[PDB]
Amino acid sequence: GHMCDAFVGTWKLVSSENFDDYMKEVGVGFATRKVAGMAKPNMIISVNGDVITIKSESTFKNTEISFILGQEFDEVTADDRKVKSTITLDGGVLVHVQKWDGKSTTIKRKREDDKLVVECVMKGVTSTRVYERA
Numbered sequence: 001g002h003m004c005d006a007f008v009g010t011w012k013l014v015s016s017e018n019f020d021d022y023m024k025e026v027g028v029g030f031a032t033r034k035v036a037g038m039a040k041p042n043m044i045i046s047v048n049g050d051v052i053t054i055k056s057e058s059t060f061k062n063t064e065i066s067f068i069l070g071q072e073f074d075e076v077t078a079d080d081r082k083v084k085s086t087i088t089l090d091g092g093v094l095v096h097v098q099k100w101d102g103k104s105t106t107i108k109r110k111r112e113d114d115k116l117v118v119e120c121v122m123k124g125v126t127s128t129r130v131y132e133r134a
């Protein structure tokens with residue numbers, strides 16, 4: 001067993017709050033905001049050794065990242081940002097920082113009851129996206 005044991009599995013998006021405002025703060029354009037905001041992605045989390053993989057499948061785009069905690073990697077996000085990402089485990093919460101164009105956003109993923117709660121933060125604007133097991 002390992003730390004991420006309660007994160008592993010397939011998760012389906014069940015609610016979203018403030019995601020359009022979060023996307024605006026990130027700089028996402030109108031058309032991408034409309035189409036991306038409609039999507040109801042799944043999140044598939046798996047662990048193999050020290051490598052964590054998070055896949056997101058949706059009608060908008062399919063993305064996948066694999067990474068080792070604390071080790072920076074390149075990520076092309078669903079909205080086509082080329083970012084430098086570092087993901088760590090802080091007190092049981094996966095903390096994902098993305099840097100690009102002098103900007104920064106943080107995505108936190110944590111277990112709460114039977115939910116996986118994803119909090120996306122950009123300059124004082126937060127979006128909460130709640131997932132439950134598929």
Ligand SMILES: O=S(=O)(O)c1cccc2cccc(Nc3ccccc3)c12
Pocket residue numbers: 023026028032036037039040041056057058060061077078079107120
């Ligand atoms: O990757 S997320 O961190 O959510 C994300 C973060 C910030 C901006 C985003 C803009 C468009 C789509 C996303 N993802 C997305 C992917 C599939 C379906 C719907 C939205 C964005």
